[PDB]
Amino acid sequence: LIVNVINGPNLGRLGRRGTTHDELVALIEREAAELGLKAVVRQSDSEAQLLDWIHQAADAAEPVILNAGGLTHTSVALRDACAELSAPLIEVHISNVHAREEFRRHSYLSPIATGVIVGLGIQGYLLALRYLAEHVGT
Amino acid sequence: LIVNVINGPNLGRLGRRGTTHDELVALIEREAAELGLKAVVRQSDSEAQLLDWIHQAADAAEPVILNAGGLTHTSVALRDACAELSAPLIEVHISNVHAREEFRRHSYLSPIATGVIVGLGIQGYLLALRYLAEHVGT
Amino acid sequence: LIVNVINGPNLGRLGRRGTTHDELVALIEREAAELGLKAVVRQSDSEAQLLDWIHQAADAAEPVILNAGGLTHTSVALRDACAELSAPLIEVHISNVHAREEFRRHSYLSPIATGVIVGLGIQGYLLALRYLAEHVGT
Amino acid sequence: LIVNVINGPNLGRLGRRGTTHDELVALIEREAAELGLKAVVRQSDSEAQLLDWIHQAADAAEPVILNAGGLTHTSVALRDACAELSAPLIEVHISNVHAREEFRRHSYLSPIATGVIVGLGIQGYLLALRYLAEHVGT
Amino acid sequence: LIVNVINGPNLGRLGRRGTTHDELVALIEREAAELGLKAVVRQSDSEAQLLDWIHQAADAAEPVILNAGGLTHTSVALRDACAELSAPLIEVHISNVHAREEFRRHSYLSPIATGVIVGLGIQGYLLALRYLAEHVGT
Amino acid sequence: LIVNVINGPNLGRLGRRGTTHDELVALIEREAAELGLKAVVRQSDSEAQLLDWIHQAADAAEPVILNAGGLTHTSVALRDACAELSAPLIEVHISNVHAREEFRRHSYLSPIATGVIVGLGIQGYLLALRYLAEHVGT
Amino acid sequence: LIVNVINGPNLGRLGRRGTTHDELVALIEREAAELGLKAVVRQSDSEAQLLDWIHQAADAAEPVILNAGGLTHTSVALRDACAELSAPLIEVHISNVHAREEFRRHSYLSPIATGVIVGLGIQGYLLALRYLAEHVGT
Amino acid sequence: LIVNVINGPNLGRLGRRGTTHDELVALIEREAAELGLKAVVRQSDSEAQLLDWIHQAADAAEPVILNAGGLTHTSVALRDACAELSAPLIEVHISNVHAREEFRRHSYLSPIATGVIVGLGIQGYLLALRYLAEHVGT
Amino acid sequence: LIVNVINGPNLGRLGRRGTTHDELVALIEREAAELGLKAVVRQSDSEAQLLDWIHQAADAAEPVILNAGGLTHTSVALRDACAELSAPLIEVHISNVHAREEFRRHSYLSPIATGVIVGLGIQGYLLALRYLAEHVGT
Amino acid sequence: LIVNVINGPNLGRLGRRGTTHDELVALIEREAAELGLKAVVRQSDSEAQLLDWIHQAADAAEPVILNAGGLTHTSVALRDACAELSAPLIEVHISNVHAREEFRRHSYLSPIATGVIVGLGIQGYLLALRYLAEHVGT
Amino acid sequence: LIVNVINGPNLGRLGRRGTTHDELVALIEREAAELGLKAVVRQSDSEAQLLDWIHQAADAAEPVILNAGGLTHTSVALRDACAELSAPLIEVHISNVHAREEFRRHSYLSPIATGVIVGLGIQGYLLALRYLAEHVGT
Amino acid sequence: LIVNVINGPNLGRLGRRGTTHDELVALIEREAAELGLKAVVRQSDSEAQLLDWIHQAADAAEPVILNAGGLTHTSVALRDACAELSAPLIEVHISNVHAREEFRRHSYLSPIATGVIVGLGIQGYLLALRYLAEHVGT
C-alpha cells in the first residue's frame, strides 16, 4: 500500500542539472495510483534528513525506492540505516552509473538492497513501483 | 515491435539450480503481447551461439534483453558483440549480483548497456519489456 | 571533571536497530557520578552538529568519548575537528568492527585518538569513563 | 563582477585550529574591491548548505572559489553540484595538501575545477580573485 | 572467576623498551582481587609457549586477555589457537597501534576476539578485567 | 628580489604544441618589474641542465617557480635537487593536470614544494610571482 | 558406484603437449574397477559440452572428478554449474599449478569443490577415485 | 610454405562492426602468393574450434598468425594451446589495443608469441606474412 | 621406504579443535605398512622443532608429507628449509583451505612442493603415502 | 617520402649488448629506397636529443618510427613530445617486450602511437617502413 | 670492542643448503681480532632465542650484525626487539635478496637498521665488522 | 686492477646537500691504492653521460661501483646498460634508502647487481672496493 520514494542530494535540480523533480513526483503518484499503491515522495540534500525518512520507513515496515545520489558511493551511515528496513529496498539511478567514472561503479547500498535499477531514466522509478505492487501476493 | 530476450549459460536450469525456463518463456511472451510487442526468447550454454544471436539483433537493429549468466563477468567477446547493437540493450540478473561474491560486482556488459536490472527476480525481464514498450514514442 | 560523550548517526536507534539510547545516557551518567565526573551525552545524525559539539570541546579543553557510527569510516571533516582536541579522545564502537565488513576495519579517527575500545558493548563507554577518571592525577 | 567564495567544514575555526575567518572575509572583500569585483564570502559546516550555495551560483552563472575542507576528499555530492557550474571554479587549500597524509592527495573536485591553488596560505584566495578579474576580457 | 592474561614477545621488556612487567602483574592481580576474580598472568617470547597457554584456556573454558605483541600482525597459528576459545577473548595493546606504522593496523586476532582495547596504557588490562567481571551475570 | 622561473621539457614548444615561450618570458619579466622583483626565466629539455639551475638557486638561496613538464611525474633526481632549496618553491602547471590522464595526478615535486598552482594558464606564473612579492615582509 | 571424470580443454593432447588421454582412460577404468566403482571418463574442448556433463551429474547426484584445464582460472559459468552438484567434486591438476605463472594460483573451482589435488601427475585422478570409494560408508 | 591465419570471435563481422572478412581472405591469399607462401585463413566464434585449428598447426609444425579478438584478454585455454606451437606465432590486432579500454592492454598471448603487431589495420596481417617469408633462410 | 609425516602448530588438538592426533598416527602407520613403507609421524607447535625435522629429512634424502598449519601462510623460514629437500614434499591440509578466509589461499610451501592435497580429510595423508609408494619404480 | 627512424638509449650497442647499429641503418636505408621512401636514421642516449628530433618531425609533419629503449617505460616527456606528431608514429621493439620483466609490459608511447611492432627483430623496422609506404594513397 | 653477530633460521646449514657455519665463525673471529674487536657469533633456528640475544645486546648497548634469514621478511617481533638497540645494527644477507622472489625484497629490519649489506657473500659479515671498527672514533 | 666508481645526479653536491665529492674521490683513491687497485671516479648529472661510462666498463670488462642517485628508482635505460656488465656491479647508497620515503625502497638496479650496500655512509664505497680486491683470487 504505502511506498516511500526518497531522493538524495542534487535530485531537486532535475531538469536543469527536461523532467523536473515536481513532474517526477506527479508521474510517480499517477503510476502508484494506477497500481493501487500510495507513493510518498521526498527529496533532500541533507544526509540527516534522509536518515530520518529511512528510520521512519523502518519503524513502519514500509518499502523504500531510494535514489541516494552521490551518497550511494560514500555513506556508510545511510547504508546502515537502510540495513534496518524489513520491507523491500530498491536502489534506483536515472543514468547508467556503470558508463561513467569508475568511482560510481561501487555502491554501499547495492549489497543490502533487494535489487537495483539503473540507466532506464525516470521510468526506473515507475518500474520499481510495479515490482512492489506485484510483490504483495502471498 | 520485436524484442530479443537472450539467456546465457546455466539459465536452462532455472527451477532446479521454482519457475522453470519454459515458464519464464511463457511469462515473457504473455507480457510482451499485453504490451504490443513480440518477444523472441532464446537460451544457450554456448558463447558462440549467444554471439550469433547478438549479431543477428545487430543486423536487424532490434533491442535486446540479455542475462548472460557467468559470461557477464568474464567475456570480452560478448561485450564486443553487444557494442555493435544500435537498439537498446538491457542487462538483467535475477538475483542481486551485488550481494554475493565480490567477483560478481564487475560486469563487462554494464558499461555498454542502456541500463541494468538486478535482484528483482524473473519480474526483471518483464520490467525490461515495459521500458522498451514505453521507449518507442518519438 | 566534565567529559563529553558524543554519538553519531543511527545511535539514536539503539535498542531497535535491547538497551535504548535513553538508558545508555542513564547508565553513563550514573557511572560518571560514581567516578566523580560529570558526563554530558549528546547524539545527532547531523555531521554539522557533531562538528559543533567537537569544536566546543576543543575550545573548553574537555575530553571526548566519541562513537561516530558510519562517519568513523568516511569523514575527513570529523577527523580534522577531532585533531584540534587537546584533551583525550577515546573512540568507541559497541560491536567488534573488525568482525564485520572489511570496510569497517579502517577508521579515520583511530590514528588521532588517544585510544579505541571496540566490541565490549555499551560497557565500552563506561570503561572509557574509567580511563578518564584515573588519568587526572599529576 | 560577483564572485562567490565558499568555505566548508572547520574553516570557521581559522586562527585557532593567526588570521581568523572574519579577517579572511575582510581581506577578500578589500582585494575584490581593488580588482573591481564584488566578493560574497560564505562558510558552513553543513554539506547541504554548501550544496545550496553551489546551486545558487549555478543558476546565476557566477564563478566560485571553493575551499571545501575535508569534503574535498570525500563528497561525490559536492562534486556533482560543482559539475553544474558554467563559470569558473577554482579549488583552494591554505596548506599544501600534498605534504600531509596520503589520503589528502586525492580530490573529487580537482578534475572538474578550472584550476587549483594549494599551499600559498590565505593569499591563495586573493590570487584566485585575480585570475577571475583578468579572465573577463573577450 | 579465573582469567588468564597472556603477554607475547617483548612484553617482558616493559619499562626499558616506566612500569615493569612485574609491576604490571602486581597491578593486574590487585585489580582482579577487587573485582572478585583470580588473574593468572604469563609472558613468553616463544610462540609455542603462547599456543600452549591458549590451548589450556580452551580446554578449561576460561577467558583470555591477550597482548600478543608483534605476533598480532603476523601469526595465523596464534589466531587459530584463539579461535578455539569458547570464553571471551579481549585483545589489548598498550600503545595506539593505529597511530604508528601502517602494518600495525591489521590484526589477525581482532576478527576472532570479543573485543579490543588499544592506546589506553597498562590501564587497558584493568579495563578488560572489569568487562569480564561484569559479564558473568545471567 | 631575484626569482628564478624554470621551465622543463617541451615548454619551449608553447604556442604550437597561442602564447609562445618568448611571449611568456616577456609577460613574466613585465609582471616582475611591476612587483619590484627581477625574474630570470630559463627553459631546457635537458634534466641535467634543469638540475644545474636548481643547484644554483640552492647555493644563492633564491626562490624558484618550476614547471617541470613531464619530469614532474617521473624524476626523483629533480625532486632531490629541489629539496635542497631553502627559499620558496612554487610548482606550476598551465593546464589542469587533474583533468587528464590518471598518471598526471601524482607529482614528485608537490610534497616538497611550498605550494602548487595548476589550471590557471600562463597567469599561474604571474600569480606565483605575486605570492613571492607579498612573502618578503618580516 | 558411478563416478564421472571430466577433462577440459587441451587434455585431449596429453602425451604430446608420455601417457596419452586414451591410456589415462584405461588407467582410471582399471582403478575404478578395483575399487568397486564405475568410472565414466569424458573430455572436451567445448565449455558448453563440459557444462552439459556437469548438469547431468547434478541431476543424477553423482560425484565428479574435474580437471578443467585453463577454464579453472577463467570460467564463472563452469563454477556455477559445479555449485549445483550435491555429491563430491574433486578438482585435479596433473602439474603443480602453484609452481608456474601467478595467474594459475587462483581457481574459481577450488572454493566450491570438496577438495583439490595438484602436482601428483596422472596418479591424482586415481587418488581422487580412492577418496570417493572410502567416502561411501555411513 | 603453409601459414595459418586464424581469426577469433567477431572477426567475421569485419566491415560492419569497410573491408569485409572475405576481402581480408583475398588480400592475404594474394600477398602470400607473392611471397611464395600458401595462406590458410579460418575464422570462428567458437573457442573449441579455434583450439582445434591451433592443435592442428602444432601437430604439423606450421606457423600461425592469430587475431584472437576478445579471447586475447580472457582465455588461458587458448594460451595453453598456443604454447604447444613450435613454429612462429604472431599475434595481430587491427586496432591499437593500447589506445582503448585499460583491460585490452593485457594479453595472455603476447608473452608466448614470437611477436605482436597492433594498430596497423588489415596491413598487419600482410606484414606478419612478410616476417614469416623472410624467416625461412638458414 | 621411510616417509616422514610432519604436523605443525595446533594439529596436536585434532579431535577437539572426532579423529585425534594419536588415531591419525595409528591410521598412517597401518596404511604405510600395507604399502610397504615405514611412516615416522611427528607433531610440534614449535617452528624451530619443525625446521630440525625438515633438516634431518634433507640430510637423509627422505620424502616428507607436511601439514604446516598456520605456518603454511606465514613462514619463509619453513619454506626455505623445505627447498633443501631432494625427495618429494607433499603439502596436506585436512580442510579445503580455498573455502575459508582469503588469506589461507596463499601458501609459501605450494610453489616448492611436489604437489598438494587439500579438503580430503585425514584421508589426504593416506593418499599422499600412496603417491610415494607408487613413485619408487625406476 | 621522408620517414624518420629514431633510436633511444642503448641502441647504439646493438650487436654487442649480431647486427650492429650501422648495419641496421644500411638495411633501413636500402628498404626505404626500394619502397620509394627516404629514411633518416638517428640514435641517441640523450632524452633531450630525442626530444629535439621529435620536435623537428612535428614541425615538418613527417612520420616517425621510434624505438625509445628504456624510455618507453619511463618518460612522460617523450610521450608528450610524441603526442604533437600529426603524421604516423610506429613504436618498435626488437625483442618481445611482453616475454620479459613485468615492468616492460607498460609503455607510455603505445596509447599515443598509430601502432606498435614487437618481437619481430630488426625486420620490425622494415615492416614499419612498408606500412608507411602503403599508407600514402588517398 | 664487543660486536654480536647473530644468525637466524637455516644458517646453521651453510655449506650444504661450501663454507660451513663453523668456518664462518672462524673467519669472523680472525677478522675481528685483526680489527681490534671481539666478535661473539651465535646462530639459532628459534625466534625466541634470537630475541633473547637481541635483548642482551640492547641492555649492554653493543652493536649487532644480524642475518635473520627468513624472519627478515616476516617477523614484527624481531623488528621490535631490534628497535630497542642503541648501538649500530647492520643487516646482512649472503645472497642478493633483490635477485630472487619478489617477497624477499621487503624487509621489516631494513628501515630500523643503520645499514644493510646484501649479495657480497660471507665477506658481507667481514665488511660489516670493518664499518663498526672505523665507527668508534669521536 | 681498475675499478670504476660512478656517481649519478646530485652527488656532486655532497657536503652541502660534511665530506665533499672531491674528498670522497681522495678517500676512494687512497683506499684503492692500499688494496692494490686503481680507482677511476666519475660523477655526472647527465643520464647519457652515465650510460657512456657504463658502456665503456662493459667493453673493458671492468667492475663498477655505482651510486646512481635518484636514477636508481626511475631509469630502465641505466638498468639495461648495467645488465651488459660482465664484471661485478656493486650498488651503493650513502644513506639508508629503506628508512625514507616508500618510493626509495624499489631499485631497478638491485636485481641485476652483484650486491648492494646502503646506510654505511661514504665508507660503503670503501667496503665495496675491499669486496672487489678480495674477489680477484682464482
PDB file of N, CA and C in Angstrom, chain K residues 1-4 54-66 81-91 112-115 131-132 135-136, chain L residues 120:
ATOM      1  N   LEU K   1      84.412  -2.318  20.719  1.00  0.00           N
ATOM      2  CA  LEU K   1      85.059  -3.596  21.261  1.00  0.00           C
ATOM      3  C   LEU K   1      84.317  -4.938  21.079  1.00  0.00           C
ATOM      4  N   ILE K   2      83.213  -5.179  21.777  1.00  0.00           N
ATOM      5  CA  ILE K   2      82.415  -6.378  21.554  1.00  0.00           C
ATOM      6  C   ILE K   2      81.386  -6.088  20.410  1.00  0.00           C
ATOM      7  N   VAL K   3      81.341  -7.004  19.441  1.00  0.00           N
ATOM      8  CA  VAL K   3      80.295  -6.942  18.429  1.00  0.00           C
ATOM      9  C   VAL K   3      79.612  -8.301  18.435  1.00  0.00           C
ATOM     10  N   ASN K   4      78.282  -8.373  18.356  1.00  0.00           N
ATOM     11  CA  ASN K   4      77.487  -9.519  18.323  1.00  0.00           C
ATOM     12  C   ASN K   4      77.141  -9.885  16.884  1.00  0.00           C
ATOM     13  N   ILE K  54      69.134 -10.431  21.109  1.00  0.00           N
ATOM     14  CA  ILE K  54      68.931  -9.023  20.832  1.00  0.00           C
ATOM     15  C   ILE K  54      68.676  -8.182  22.093  1.00  0.00           C
ATOM     16  N   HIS K  55      67.855  -8.807  23.023  1.00  0.00           N
ATOM     17  CA  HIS K  55      67.586  -8.115  24.259  1.00  0.00           C
ATOM     18  C   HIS K  55      68.934  -7.855  25.041  1.00  0.00           C
ATOM     19  N   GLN K  56      69.762  -8.899  25.041  1.00  0.00           N
ATOM     20  CA  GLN K  56      71.021  -8.754  25.767  1.00  0.00           C
ATOM     21  C   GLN K  56      71.902  -7.642  25.144  1.00  0.00           C
ATOM     22  N   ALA K  57      71.944  -7.529  23.817  1.00  0.00           N
ATOM     23  CA  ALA K  57      72.727  -6.514  23.183  1.00  0.00           C
ATOM     24  C   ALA K  57      72.187  -5.111  23.494  1.00  0.00           C
ATOM     25  N   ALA K  58      70.840  -4.998  23.562  1.00  0.00           N
ATOM     26  CA  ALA K  58      70.154  -3.800  23.957  1.00  0.00           C
ATOM     27  C   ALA K  58      70.573  -3.395  25.374  1.00  0.00           C
ATOM     28  N   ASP K  59      70.512  -4.319  26.280  1.00  0.00           N
ATOM     29  CA  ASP K  59      70.881  -3.986  27.687  1.00  0.00           C
ATOM     30  C   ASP K  59      72.368  -3.592  27.729  1.00  0.00           C
ATOM     31  N   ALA K  60      73.258  -4.139  26.976  1.00  0.00           N
ATOM     32  CA  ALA K  60      74.684  -3.901  27.053  1.00  0.00           C
ATOM     33  C   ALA K  60      75.051  -2.746  26.143  1.00  0.00           C
ATOM     34  N   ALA K  61      74.196  -2.232  25.238  1.00  0.00           N
ATOM     35  CA  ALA K  61      74.488  -1.204  24.271  1.00  0.00           C
ATOM     36  C   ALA K  61      75.625  -1.654  23.364  1.00  0.00           C
ATOM     37  N   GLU K  62      75.595  -2.905  22.898  1.00  0.00           N
ATOM     38  CA  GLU K  62      76.603  -3.425  21.958  1.00  0.00           C
ATOM     39  C   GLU K  62      75.994  -3.505  20.532  1.00  0.00           C
ATOM     40  N   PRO K  63      76.814  -3.196  19.539  1.00  0.00           N
ATOM     41  CA  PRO K  63      76.348  -3.363  18.139  1.00  0.00           C
ATOM     42  C   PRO K  63      76.006  -4.806  17.818  1.00  0.00           C
ATOM     43  N   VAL K  64      75.188  -4.907  16.759  1.00  0.00           N
ATOM     44  CA  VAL K  64      74.753  -6.124  16.213  1.00  0.00           C
ATOM     45  C   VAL K  64      74.896  -6.191  14.679  1.00  0.00           C
ATOM     46  N   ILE K  65      75.388  -7.322  14.247  1.00  0.00           N
ATOM     47  CA  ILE K  65      75.374  -7.685  12.782  1.00  0.00           C
ATOM     48  C   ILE K  65      74.392  -8.847  12.719  1.00  0.00           C
ATOM     49  N   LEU K  66      73.211  -8.694  11.992  1.00  0.00           N
ATOM     50  CA  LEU K  66      72.142  -9.648  12.032  1.00  0.00           C
ATOM     51  C   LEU K  66      71.834 -10.104  10.620  1.00  0.00           C
ATOM     52  N   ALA K  81      62.239  -5.845  18.765  1.00  0.00           N
ATOM     53  CA  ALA K  81      63.377  -6.099  19.655  1.00  0.00           C
ATOM     54  C   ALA K  81      64.582  -5.281  19.139  1.00  0.00           C
ATOM     55  N   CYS K  82      64.783  -5.342  17.819  1.00  0.00           N
ATOM     56  CA  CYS K  82      65.887  -4.593  17.210  1.00  0.00           C
ATOM     57  C   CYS K  82      65.762  -3.076  17.363  1.00  0.00           C
ATOM     58  N   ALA K  83      64.507  -2.594  17.362  1.00  0.00           N
ATOM     59  CA  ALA K  83      64.314  -1.119  17.502  1.00  0.00           C
ATOM     60  C   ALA K  83      64.829  -0.654  18.824  1.00  0.00           C
ATOM     61  N   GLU K  84      64.965  -1.514  19.850  1.00  0.00           N
ATOM     62  CA  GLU K  84      65.483  -1.103  21.153  1.00  0.00           C
ATOM     63  C   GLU K  84      67.001  -0.895  21.114  1.00  0.00           C
ATOM     64  N   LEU K  85      67.743  -1.390  20.132  1.00  0.00           N
ATOM     65  CA  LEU K  85      69.211  -1.259  20.160  1.00  0.00           C
ATOM     66  C   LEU K  85      69.568   0.227  20.001  1.00  0.00           C
ATOM     67  N   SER K  86      70.569   0.600  20.829  1.00  0.00           N
ATOM     68  CA  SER K  86      71.075   1.960  20.732  1.00  0.00           C
ATOM     69  C   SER K  86      72.321   2.031  19.879  1.00  0.00           C
ATOM     70  N   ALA K  87      73.112   0.984  19.833  1.00  0.00           N
ATOM     71  CA  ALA K  87      74.325   0.835  19.053  1.00  0.00           C
ATOM     72  C   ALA K  87      73.906   0.467  17.618  1.00  0.00           C
ATOM     73  N   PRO K  88      74.866   0.473  16.744  1.00  0.00           N
ATOM     74  CA  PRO K  88      74.547   0.161  15.350  1.00  0.00           C
ATOM     75  C   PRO K  88      74.029  -1.251  15.118  1.00  0.00           C
ATOM     76  N   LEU K  89      73.093  -1.324  14.147  1.00  0.00           N
ATOM     77  CA  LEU K  89      72.548  -2.652  13.716  1.00  0.00           C
ATOM     78  C   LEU K  89      72.802  -2.707  12.189  1.00  0.00           C
ATOM     79  N   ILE K  90      73.556  -3.692  11.732  1.00  0.00           N
ATOM     80  CA  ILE K  90      73.824  -3.888  10.293  1.00  0.00           C
ATOM     81  C   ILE K  90      73.181  -5.189   9.859  1.00  0.00           C
ATOM     82  N   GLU K  91      72.212  -5.132   8.938  1.00  0.00           N
ATOM     83  CA  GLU K  91      71.502  -6.228   8.365  1.00  0.00           C
ATOM     84  C   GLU K  91      72.400  -6.825   7.262  1.00  0.00           C
ATOM     85  N   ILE K 112      64.775  -0.022  10.223  1.00  0.00           N
ATOM     86  CA  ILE K 112      65.288   0.307  11.553  1.00  0.00           C
ATOM     87  C   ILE K 112      66.737   0.063  11.737  1.00  0.00           C
ATOM     88  N   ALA K 113      67.381  -0.499  10.678  1.00  0.00           N
ATOM     89  CA  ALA K 113      68.818  -0.792  10.777  1.00  0.00           C
ATOM     90  C   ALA K 113      69.705   0.426  10.428  1.00  0.00           C
ATOM     91  N   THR K 114      70.930   0.480  10.912  1.00  0.00           N
ATOM     92  CA  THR K 114      71.854   1.537  10.428  1.00  0.00           C
ATOM     93  C   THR K 114      72.124   1.418   8.956  1.00  0.00           C
ATOM     94  N   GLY K 115      72.382   0.175   8.502  1.00  0.00           N
ATOM     95  CA  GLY K 115      72.566  -0.067   7.082  1.00  0.00           C
ATOM     96  C   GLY K 115      72.419  -1.568   6.804  1.00  0.00           C
ATOM     97  N   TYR K 131      83.046  -1.680   9.061  1.00  0.00           N
ATOM     98  CA  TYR K 131      82.313  -0.434   9.373  1.00  0.00           C
ATOM     99  C   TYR K 131      82.386  -0.149  10.867  1.00  0.00           C
ATOM    100  N   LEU K 132      81.997  -1.095  11.686  1.00  0.00           N
ATOM    101  CA  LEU K 132      81.925  -0.939  13.157  1.00  0.00           C
ATOM    102  C   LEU K 132      83.310  -0.570  13.754  1.00  0.00           C
ATOM    103  N   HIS K 135      83.936   3.227  12.961  1.00  0.00           N
ATOM    104  CA  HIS K 135      82.863   3.921  13.552  1.00  0.00           C
ATOM    105  C   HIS K 135      82.832   3.756  15.083  1.00  0.00           C
ATOM    106  N   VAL K 136      84.024   4.049  15.590  1.00  0.00           N
ATOM    107  CA  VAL K 136      84.313   4.110  17.018  1.00  0.00           C
ATOM    108  C   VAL K 136      85.210   5.319  17.326  1.00  0.00           C
TER     109      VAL K 136
ATOM    110  N   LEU L 120      75.770   2.926   5.153  1.00  0.00           N
ATOM    111  CA  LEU L 120      77.012   2.859   5.849  1.00  0.00           C
ATOM    112  C   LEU L 120      77.822   4.134   5.524  1.00  0.00           C
TER     113      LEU L 120
END
